[PDB]
Structure 1
Amino acid sequence: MRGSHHHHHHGSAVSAKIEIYTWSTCPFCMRALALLKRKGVEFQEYCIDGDNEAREAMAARANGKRSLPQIFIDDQHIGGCDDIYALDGAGKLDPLLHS
């Protein structure tokens, strides 16, 4: 296992689980995506263009909300575009990512 390895009882390597539900052409979704992209983190986008079933799945997790986008970090609902930009403005988003 040649290389420079960090040890601190990590066990199986796992990282932050970051999810965002979008319509590809929604300007608020686009703005949220840009922020996540600028952070350089790895994330999963659920592009649900025209998919009503997926929207209902989203609503079930997002406090019944059907507005877009909806963002989750480590299974916690963070909210929408304004919520994530607000967090960043307060210096609270990097810790969630989690740095």
Structure 2
Amino acid sequence: MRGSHHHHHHGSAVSAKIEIYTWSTCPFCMRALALLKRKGVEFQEYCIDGDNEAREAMAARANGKRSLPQIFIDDQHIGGCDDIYALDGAGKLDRLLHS
């Protein structure tokens, strides 16, 4: 396989699992999406507009919270828009993303 390949016992390649539950038109969700997009990271958005079943699935993972958005990185609950911005302002978010 021609190319410039990195080796460090990675095995099968996998990357940060980044998830965000949103309503598309929530201004807090929009602000959080903008931050993740500006980082350039690959991520999954669960847009749950009008979907109560999905909100209950979200609350089950997010400490019972139904507020939006809810963000997870590598299966760890990070919190909402304020939480991710606070992490970035503290110089801690890139390391979680990771780098």
TM beyond 0.5: yes
How far apart, in 1, do the equivalents of 2:33 and 2:80 lie? 11
Aligned length: 99
Which 5+ residue runs of structure 2 have no aligned equivalent? Answer: none
TM-score (norm 2): 1.00
Residue 31 (structure 1) shift: 0.1
TM-score (norm 1): 1.00
Please give the root-mean-square deviation of Cα atoms over the aligned residues, in Å. Answer: 0.2
How far apart, in 1, do the equivalents of 2:9 and 2:68 lie? 38
How far apart, in 2, do the equivalents of 1:13 and 1:85 lie? 29
Residue 50 (structure 1) shift: 0.1
How far apart, in 2, do the equivalents of 1:82 and 1:29 lie? 10
Q: Calculate percent identity across the aligned residue pairs.
A: 99
How far apart, in 1, do the equivalents of 2:9 and 2:28 lie? 40
Residue 35 (structure 1) shift: 0.1
Residue 11 (structure 1) shift: 0.2
Which 5+ residue runs of structure 1 have no aligned equivalent? Answer: none
How far apart, in 2, do the equivalents of 1:52 and 1:7 lie? 45
